[model samples]
Target: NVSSVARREKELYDQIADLTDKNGEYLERIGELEERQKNLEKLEHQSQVAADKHYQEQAKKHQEYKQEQEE
Candidate 1:
Protein backbone atom coordinates (compact mmCIF):
# COMPACT_ATOMS: atom_id res chain seq x y z
CA ASN A 1 0.00 0.00 0.00
CA VAL A 2 2.84 2.40 0.78
CA SER A 3 4.52 1.77 -2.58
CA SER A 4 1.24 2.36 -4.39
CA VAL A 5 0.71 5.63 -2.54
CA ALA A 6 4.20 6.78 -3.44
CA ARG A 7 3.68 5.93 -7.10
CA ARG A 8 0.43 7.80 -7.21
CA GLU A 9 2.03 10.87 -5.67
CA LYS A 10 4.79 10.77 -8.25
CA GLU A 11 2.30 10.59 -11.05
CA LEU A 12 0.39 13.57 -9.69
CA TYR A 13 3.59 15.59 -9.41
CA ASP A 14 4.54 14.82 -13.02
CA GLN A 15 1.09 15.83 -14.21
CA ILE A 16 1.33 19.09 -12.30
CA ALA A 17 4.71 19.82 -13.88
CA ASP A 18 3.36 19.22 -17.38
CA LEU A 19 0.40 21.51 -16.73
CA THR A 20 2.67 24.25 -15.44
CA ASP A 21 4.83 24.05 -18.56
CA LYS A 22 1.80 24.28 -20.81
CA ASN A 23 0.53 27.29 -18.88
CA GLY A 24 3.85 29.02 -19.33
CA GLU A 25 3.72 28.45 -23.10
CA TYR A 26 0.17 29.80 -23.25
CA LEU A 27 1.22 32.92 -21.38
CA GLU A 28 4.06 33.52 -23.80
CA ARG A 29 1.76 33.15 -26.80
CA ILE A 30 -0.70 35.61 -25.27
CA GLY A 31 2.10 38.10 -24.72
CA GLU A 32 3.22 37.81 -28.33
CA LEU A 33 -0.34 38.38 -29.56
CA GLU A 34 -0.64 41.43 -27.33
CA GLU A 35 2.49 42.93 -28.81
CA ARG A 36 1.26 42.29 -32.34
CA GLN A 37 -2.11 43.85 -31.53
CA LYS A 38 -0.41 46.99 -30.24
CA ASN A 39 1.66 47.28 -33.41
CA LEU A 40 -1.43 46.89 -35.58
CA GLU A 41 -3.24 49.57 -33.63
CA LYS A 42 -0.33 51.94 -34.09
CA LEU A 43 -0.26 51.31 -37.83
CA GLU A 44 -4.02 51.80 -38.07
CA HIS A 45 -3.78 55.17 -36.33
CA GLN A 46 -1.01 56.33 -38.66
CA SER A 47 -3.03 55.37 -41.72
CA GLN A 48 -6.08 57.17 -40.36
CA VAL A 49 -4.11 60.37 -39.83
CA ALA A 50 -2.60 60.21 -43.34
CA ALA A 51 -6.04 59.71 -44.89
CA ASP A 52 -7.44 62.66 -42.97
CA LYS A 53 -4.62 64.89 -44.13
CA HIS A 54 -5.13 63.91 -47.74
CA TYR A 55 -8.88 64.49 -47.52
CA GLN A 56 -8.40 67.95 -46.05
CA GLU A 57 -5.91 68.89 -48.77
CA GLN A 58 -8.31 67.76 -51.46
CA ALA A 59 -11.14 69.79 -49.91
CA LYS A 60 -8.98 72.88 -49.77
CA LYS A 61 -8.05 72.51 -53.43
CA HIS A 62 -11.70 72.14 -54.33
CA GLN A 63 -12.53 75.34 -52.49
CA GLU A 64 -9.73 77.20 -54.28
CA TYR A 65 -11.03 75.99 -57.63
CA LYS A 66 -14.55 77.16 -56.77
CA GLN A 67 -13.22 80.64 -55.87
CA GLU A 68 -11.27 80.85 -59.10
CA GLN A 69 -14.30 79.86 -61.14
CA GLU A 70 -16.41 82.52 -59.47
CA GLU A 71 -13.83 85.24 -60.00
Candidate 2:
Protein backbone atom coordinates (compact mmCIF):
# COMPACT_ATOMS: atom_id res chain seq x y z
CA ASN A 1 0.00 0.00 0.00
CA VAL A 2 2.84 2.40 0.75
CA SER A 3 4.45 1.77 -2.68
CA SER A 4 1.16 2.45 -4.45
CA VAL A 5 0.75 5.72 -2.60
CA ALA A 6 4.24 6.82 -3.63
CA ARG A 7 3.50 6.02 -7.26
CA ARG A 8 0.30 8.00 -7.21
CA GLU A 9 2.00 11.05 -5.75
CA LYS A 10 4.63 11.01 -8.46
CA GLU A 11 1.95 10.82 -11.15
CA LEU A 12 0.11 13.81 -9.71
CA TYR A 13 3.32 15.83 -9.61
CA ASP A 14 4.05 15.04 -13.24
CA GLN A 15 0.61 16.22 -14.29
CA ILE A 16 1.05 19.46 -12.40
CA ALA A 17 4.33 20.12 -14.17
CA ASP A 18 2.79 19.47 -17.57
CA LEU A 19 -0.05 21.89 -16.90
CA THR A 20 2.37 24.59 -15.78
CA ASP A 21 4.27 24.31 -19.07
CA LYS A 22 1.08 24.66 -21.06
CA ASN A 23 0.11 27.76 -19.11
CA GLY A 24 3.45 29.35 -19.89
CA GLU A 25 2.92 28.75 -23.63
CA TYR A 26 -0.53 30.34 -23.50
CA LEU A 27 0.86 33.45 -21.79
CA GLU A 28 3.52 33.84 -24.48
CA ARG A 29 0.89 33.64 -27.21
CA ILE A 30 -1.23 36.29 -25.52
CA GLY A 31 1.74 38.65 -25.37
CA GLU A 32 2.39 38.26 -29.09
CA LEU A 33 -1.26 38.97 -29.93
CA GLU A 34 -1.25 42.13 -27.87
CA GLU A 35 1.81 43.42 -29.66
CA ARG A 36 0.13 42.82 -33.01
CA GLN A 37 -2.93 44.72 -31.88
CA LYS A 38 -0.83 47.74 -31.01
CA ASN A 39 0.72 47.78 -34.46
CA LEU A 40 -2.69 47.69 -36.14
CA GLU A 41 -3.92 50.60 -34.04
CA LYS A 42 -0.94 52.70 -35.01
CA LEU A 43 -1.55 52.02 -38.70
CA GLU A 44 -5.21 52.95 -38.38
CA HIS A 45 -4.39 56.29 -36.75
CA GLN A 46 -1.93 57.18 -39.51
CA SER A 47 -4.51 56.53 -42.23
CA GLN A 48 -7.07 58.64 -40.43
CA VAL A 49 -4.71 61.58 -40.23
CA ALA A 50 -3.89 61.35 -43.90
CA ALA A 51 -7.55 61.31 -44.86
CA ASP A 52 -8.27 64.39 -42.74
CA LYS A 53 -5.45 66.35 -44.36
CA HIS A 54 -6.74 65.46 -47.83
CA TYR A 55 -10.24 66.67 -46.94
CA GLN A 56 -9.00 69.99 -45.59
CA GLU A 57 -6.99 70.66 -48.75
CA GLN A 58 -10.01 70.00 -50.92
CA ALA A 59 -12.15 72.41 -48.92
CA LYS A 60 -9.54 75.16 -49.20
CA LYS A 61 -9.38 74.73 -52.99
CA HIS A 62 -13.12 74.96 -53.30
CA GLN A 63 -13.18 78.21 -51.33
CA GLU A 64 -10.50 79.73 -53.59
CA TYR A 65 -12.36 78.69 -56.74
CA LYS A 66 -15.51 80.40 -55.53
CA GLN A 67 -13.67 83.66 -54.82
CA GLU A 68 -12.12 83.71 -58.31
CA GLN A 69 -15.50 83.12 -59.93
CA GLU A 70 -17.07 86.06 -58.01
CA GLU A 71 -14.26 88.44 -59.16
Candidate 3:
Protein backbone atom coordinates (compact mmCIF):
# COMPACT_ATOMS: atom_id res chain seq x y z
CA ASN A 1 0.00 0.00 0.00
CA VAL A 2 2.75 2.44 0.89
CA SER A 3 4.72 1.67 -2.25
CA SER A 4 1.65 2.13 -4.42
CA VAL A 5 0.92 5.52 -2.82
CA ALA A 6 4.54 6.63 -3.27
CA ARG A 7 4.46 5.66 -6.94
CA ARG A 8 1.25 7.59 -7.48
CA GLU A 9 2.70 10.61 -5.72
CA LYS A 10 5.71 10.63 -8.01
CA GLU A 11 3.42 10.45 -11.02
CA LEU A 12 1.43 13.43 -9.76
CA TYR A 13 4.56 15.52 -9.40
CA ASP A 14 5.75 14.51 -12.85
CA GLN A 15 2.42 15.63 -14.31
CA ILE A 16 2.76 19.08 -12.76
CA ALA A 17 6.22 19.57 -14.29
CA ASP A 18 4.82 19.33 -17.84
CA LEU A 19 2.41 22.21 -17.39
CA THR A 20 3.21 25.71 -18.70
CA ASP A 21 5.28 27.93 -16.43
CA LYS A 22 2.99 30.45 -14.76
CA ASN A 23 4.96 32.06 -11.94
CA GLY A 24 6.00 35.40 -13.49
CA GLU A 25 3.09 35.72 -15.91
CA TYR A 26 0.64 34.77 -13.20
CA LEU A 27 2.19 37.32 -10.84
CA GLU A 28 1.82 40.09 -13.43
CA ARG A 29 -1.77 39.13 -14.21
CA ILE A 30 -2.47 38.90 -10.51
CA GLY A 31 -1.16 42.45 -10.10
CA GLU A 32 -3.49 43.68 -12.81
CA LEU A 33 -6.48 41.82 -11.36
CA GLU A 34 -5.74 43.06 -7.86
CA GLU A 35 -5.53 46.60 -9.18
CA ARG A 36 -9.10 46.31 -10.48
CA GLN A 37 -10.45 44.18 -7.62
CA LYS A 38 -9.33 46.66 -4.97
CA ASN A 39 -11.94 49.24 -5.90
CA LEU A 40 -14.82 46.83 -6.41
CA GLU A 41 -14.25 45.51 -2.90
CA LYS A 42 -14.97 48.95 -1.36
CA LEU A 43 -18.51 49.39 -2.64
CA GLU A 44 -21.67 49.89 -0.60
CA HIS A 45 -23.64 48.64 -3.63
CA GLN A 46 -21.99 47.61 -6.92
CA SER A 47 -22.67 50.03 -9.80
CA GLN A 48 -21.43 49.92 -13.42
CA VAL A 49 -20.18 53.49 -13.15
CA ALA A 50 -17.90 52.58 -10.26
CA ALA A 51 -16.85 49.27 -11.81
CA ASP A 52 -16.01 50.64 -15.29
CA LYS A 53 -14.22 53.67 -13.93
CA HIS A 54 -12.07 51.41 -11.79
CA TYR A 55 -11.25 49.29 -14.85
CA GLN A 56 -10.11 52.30 -16.90
CA GLU A 57 -7.81 53.43 -14.11
CA GLN A 58 -6.38 49.92 -13.68
CA ALA A 59 -5.81 49.57 -17.44
CA LYS A 60 -3.72 52.73 -17.42
CA LYS A 61 -1.80 51.52 -14.39
CA HIS A 62 -1.14 48.11 -15.96
CA GLN A 63 0.41 49.63 -19.09
CA GLU A 64 2.56 51.93 -17.01
CA TYR A 65 3.85 49.04 -14.88
CA LYS A 66 4.46 46.80 -17.89
CA GLN A 67 6.37 49.54 -19.70
CA GLU A 68 8.40 50.26 -16.61
CA GLN A 69 9.45 46.60 -16.35
CA GLU A 70 10.53 46.54 -20.01
CA GLU A 71 13.43 48.87 -19.33
Candidate 4:
Protein backbone atom coordinates (compact mmCIF):
# COMPACT_ATOMS: atom_id res chain seq x y z
CA ASN A 1 0.00 0.00 0.00
CA VAL A 2 1.13 3.58 -0.82
CA SER A 3 1.00 6.56 1.59
CA SER A 4 -1.07 9.64 0.68
CA VAL A 5 0.86 12.71 -0.54
CA ALA A 6 -0.85 14.96 2.01
CA ARG A 7 0.30 12.78 4.88
CA ARG A 8 3.89 12.85 3.62
CA GLU A 9 3.77 16.62 3.26
CA LYS A 10 2.47 17.06 6.78
CA GLU A 11 5.24 14.87 8.15
CA LEU A 12 7.91 16.87 6.36
CA TYR A 13 6.50 20.14 7.64
CA ASP A 14 6.44 18.89 11.20
CA GLN A 15 10.00 17.70 10.94
CA ILE A 16 11.15 21.05 9.60
CA ALA A 17 9.50 22.93 12.43
CA ASP A 18 11.02 20.65 15.05
CA LEU A 19 14.50 20.97 13.57
CA THR A 20 14.20 24.76 13.33
CA ASP A 21 13.27 25.14 16.97
CA LYS A 22 16.05 22.79 18.10
CA ASN A 23 18.68 24.59 16.01
CA GLY A 24 17.69 27.97 17.42
CA GLU A 25 17.97 26.64 20.97
CA TYR A 26 21.42 25.19 20.30
CA LEU A 27 22.64 28.51 18.90
CA GLU A 28 21.43 30.38 21.96
CA ARG A 29 23.17 27.92 24.31
CA ILE A 30 26.41 28.21 22.31
CA GLY A 31 26.36 31.99 22.73
CA GLU A 32 25.85 31.69 26.49
CA LEU A 33 28.73 29.19 26.81
CA GLU A 34 31.01 31.48 24.82
CA GLU A 35 30.25 34.37 27.18
CA ARG A 36 31.02 32.20 30.22
CA GLN A 37 34.37 31.22 28.70
CA LYS A 38 35.26 34.87 28.16
CA ASN A 39 34.40 35.69 31.77
CA LEU A 40 36.60 32.85 33.01
CA GLU A 41 39.51 34.19 30.98
CA LYS A 42 39.01 37.65 32.48
CA LEU A 43 39.09 36.26 36.06
CA GLU A 44 42.14 34.04 35.40
CA HIS A 45 44.66 36.66 36.45
CA GLN A 46 42.79 37.59 39.65
CA SER A 47 42.61 33.93 40.64
CA GLN A 48 46.36 33.50 40.16
CA VAL A 49 47.07 36.55 42.34
CA ALA A 50 44.89 35.28 45.15
CA ALA A 51 46.57 31.89 45.07
CA ASP A 52 50.05 33.43 45.19
CA LYS A 53 49.14 35.73 48.08
CA HIS A 54 47.80 32.85 50.16
CA TYR A 55 50.96 30.86 49.60
CA GLN A 56 53.15 33.78 50.60
CA GLU A 57 51.18 34.41 53.79
CA GLN A 58 51.46 30.77 54.83
CA ALA A 59 55.24 30.76 54.22
CA LYS A 60 55.71 33.96 56.21
CA LYS A 61 53.85 32.52 59.22
CA HIS A 62 55.93 29.33 59.04
CA GLN A 63 59.20 31.27 58.99
CA GLU A 64 58.14 33.35 61.99
CA TYR A 65 57.44 30.20 64.03
CA LYS A 66 60.85 28.68 63.12
CA GLN A 67 62.61 31.91 64.11
CA GLU A 68 60.87 31.95 67.53
CA GLN A 69 62.06 28.37 68.15
CA GLU A 70 65.67 29.48 67.48
CA GLU A 71 65.35 32.29 70.02
Candidate 5:
Protein backbone atom coordinates (compact mmCIF):
# COMPACT_ATOMS: atom_id res chain seq x y z
CA ASN A 1 0.00 0.00 0.00
CA VAL A 2 2.87 2.41 0.74
CA SER A 3 4.49 1.88 -2.66
CA SER A 4 1.18 2.37 -4.40
CA VAL A 5 0.65 5.71 -2.71
CA ALA A 6 4.14 6.84 -3.75
CA ARG A 7 3.47 5.86 -7.37
CA ARG A 8 0.28 7.86 -7.45
CA GLU A 9 2.02 10.91 -6.03
CA LYS A 10 4.68 10.82 -8.72
CA GLU A 11 2.09 10.66 -11.50
CA LEU A 12 0.26 13.71 -10.15
CA TYR A 13 3.58 15.56 -9.77
CA ASP A 14 4.29 15.16 -13.48
CA GLN A 15 0.80 16.43 -14.33
CA ILE A 16 1.37 19.55 -12.19
CA ALA A 17 4.54 20.36 -14.11
CA ASP A 18 2.67 20.07 -17.41
CA LEU A 19 -0.11 22.33 -16.14
CA THR A 20 2.33 25.08 -15.22
CA ASP A 21 3.94 24.93 -18.66
CA LYS A 22 0.54 25.32 -20.30
CA ASN A 23 -0.23 28.36 -18.13
CA GLY A 24 3.00 30.03 -19.24
CA GLU A 25 2.10 29.51 -22.91
CA TYR A 26 -1.29 31.20 -22.43
CA LEU A 27 0.31 34.17 -20.64
CA GLU A 28 2.66 34.68 -23.58
CA ARG A 29 -0.26 34.62 -25.96
CA ILE A 30 -2.06 37.27 -23.91
CA GLY A 31 0.96 39.55 -24.18
CA GLU A 32 0.98 39.22 -27.97
CA LEU A 33 -2.76 39.95 -28.15
CA GLU A 34 -2.35 43.11 -26.10
CA GLU A 35 0.33 44.39 -28.44
CA ARG A 36 -1.88 43.79 -31.45
CA GLN A 37 -4.73 45.72 -29.80
CA LYS A 38 -2.49 48.74 -29.34
CA ASN A 39 -1.51 48.68 -33.00
CA LEU A 40 -5.16 48.41 -34.06
CA GLU A 41 -6.07 51.44 -32.00
CA LYS A 42 -3.37 53.50 -33.65
CA LEU A 43 -4.53 52.45 -37.10
CA GLU A 44 -8.12 53.40 -36.29
CA HIS A 45 -7.04 56.87 -35.20
CA GLN A 46 -5.07 57.37 -38.41
CA SER A 47 -8.05 56.31 -40.52
CA GLN A 48 -10.33 58.79 -38.76
CA VAL A 49 -7.93 61.67 -39.36
CA ALA A 50 -7.68 60.87 -43.07
CA ALA A 51 -11.46 60.64 -43.42
CA ASP A 52 -11.98 64.00 -41.74
CA LYS A 53 -9.51 65.70 -44.06
CA HIS A 54 -11.17 64.26 -47.15
CA TYR A 55 -14.60 65.39 -46.00
CA GLN A 56 -13.37 68.94 -45.41
CA GLU A 57 -11.83 69.11 -48.88
CA GLN A 58 -15.05 67.92 -50.51
CA ALA A 59 -17.14 70.47 -48.59
CA LYS A 60 -14.86 73.32 -49.70
CA LYS A 61 -15.19 72.33 -53.36
CA HIS A 62 -18.95 72.06 -53.07
CA GLN A 63 -19.19 75.56 -51.60
CA GLU A 64 -17.06 76.99 -54.42
CA TYR A 65 -19.20 75.27 -57.07
CA LYS A 66 -22.38 76.68 -55.55
CA GLN A 67 -21.01 80.24 -55.60
CA GLU A 68 -20.05 79.94 -59.26
CA GLN A 69 -23.53 78.70 -60.14
CA GLU A 70 -25.12 81.70 -58.38
CA GLU A 71 -22.91 84.21 -60.20
Candidate 6:
Protein backbone atom coordinates (compact mmCIF):
# COMPACT_ATOMS: atom_id res chain seq x y z
CA ASN A 1 0.00 0.00 0.00
CA VAL A 2 2.79 2.45 0.88
CA SER A 3 4.68 1.66 -2.30
CA SER A 4 1.53 2.19 -4.35
CA VAL A 5 0.98 5.62 -2.77
CA ALA A 6 4.61 6.61 -3.30
CA ARG A 7 4.46 5.54 -6.95
CA ARG A 8 1.35 7.59 -7.54
CA GLU A 9 2.86 10.57 -5.79
CA LYS A 10 5.88 10.43 -8.08
CA GLU A 11 3.57 10.13 -11.08
CA LEU A 12 1.64 13.20 -10.00
CA TYR A 13 4.76 15.35 -9.78
CA ASP A 14 6.00 13.93 -13.07
CA GLN A 15 2.77 15.08 -14.74
CA ILE A 16 3.12 18.50 -13.19
CA ALA A 17 6.71 18.74 -14.45
CA ASP A 18 5.60 17.81 -17.94
CA LEU A 19 2.92 20.49 -17.99
CA THR A 20 5.25 23.28 -16.79
CA ASP A 21 8.31 22.74 -18.94
CA LYS A 22 9.84 25.10 -21.51
CA ASN A 23 7.66 23.68 -24.32
CA GLY A 24 4.46 23.54 -22.25
CA GLU A 25 1.60 26.03 -22.48
CA TYR A 26 1.14 25.78 -18.72
CA LEU A 27 4.59 27.13 -17.92
CA GLU A 28 3.37 30.60 -17.03
CA ARG A 29 -0.04 29.61 -15.77
CA ILE A 30 1.07 29.06 -12.19
CA GLY A 31 2.88 32.41 -12.07
CA GLU A 32 -0.19 34.21 -13.46
CA LEU A 33 -2.47 32.46 -10.99
CA GLU A 34 -0.19 33.34 -8.04
CA GLU A 35 -0.24 37.03 -8.93
CA ARG A 36 -4.05 37.05 -8.79
CA GLN A 37 -4.19 34.99 -5.57
CA LYS A 38 -3.16 37.90 -3.36
CA ASN A 39 -4.89 41.28 -2.86
CA LEU A 40 -1.93 43.27 -1.49
CA GLU A 41 -1.81 46.32 -3.73
CA LYS A 42 -3.74 48.47 -1.28
CA LEU A 43 -1.65 47.20 1.61
CA GLU A 44 1.55 47.90 -0.32
CA HIS A 45 0.44 51.46 -1.10
CA GLN A 46 -0.44 52.07 2.51
CA SER A 47 2.99 50.91 3.71
CA GLN A 48 4.73 53.09 1.12
CA VAL A 49 2.76 56.13 2.22
CA ALA A 50 3.54 55.39 5.83
CA ALA A 51 7.26 54.99 5.06
CA ASP A 52 7.32 58.29 3.18
CA LYS A 53 5.67 60.03 6.05
CA HIS A 54 8.13 58.53 8.52
CA TYR A 55 11.16 59.60 6.48
CA GLN A 56 9.79 63.10 6.09
CA GLU A 57 9.35 63.36 9.83
CA GLN A 58 12.90 62.12 10.39
CA ALA A 59 14.26 64.67 7.91
CA LYS A 60 12.46 67.49 9.71
CA LYS A 61 13.79 66.32 13.05
CA HIS A 62 17.35 66.21 11.71
CA GLN A 63 17.01 69.77 10.37
CA GLU A 64 15.83 70.96 13.77
CA TYR A 65 18.75 69.23 15.44
CA LYS A 66 21.18 70.85 13.00
CA GLN A 67 19.69 74.26 13.74
CA GLU A 68 19.92 73.63 17.48
CA GLN A 69 23.63 72.74 17.07
CA GLU A 70 24.22 76.00 15.18
CA GLU A 71 22.72 78.03 18.06
lDDT of 2 by residue, 1-71 (tens): 99999999999999999999999999899999999899999999999999999999999999999999988
Clashing pairs in 1: none
Query: Which runs in model 5 stand beyond 4 Å of their true positions?
Result: none
Candidate 4 regions exceeding 4 Å error are: 1-3, 49-71
Candidate 2 Cα misplacement greater than 4 A, ranges: none
Highest-lDDT candidate: 1
Candidate 1 vs. truth: CA RMSD? 0.9
- Per-residue lDDT tens digits of candidate 1, residues 1-71? 99999999999999999999999999999999999999999999999999999999999999999999979
Each model's lDDT: 0.99, 0.97, 0.82, 0.94, 0.97, 0.84
Q: Model 5, 29: alpha-carbon shift in Å?
A: 1.0
lDDT of 1: 0.99
Q: Which residue pairs clash within candidate 6?
A: none
Structure candidate 3, residue pairs in collision: none
Order of quality (TM-score): 1, 2, 5, 4, 6, 3
Q: What digit string (tens of lDDT, one per residue) describes model 4 on residues 1-71?
A: 15688889889999999999999999999999999999998799789999999999999999999999988
Cα displacement (Å) at residue 28, model 6: 18
Task: Identify the runs in model 1 with alpha carbons over 4 angstroms from their true place.
Answer: none
- lDDT, candidate 3, residue 56? 100
lDDT of 6: 0.84
lDDT minimum window of 10 residues, candidate 2: 32-41
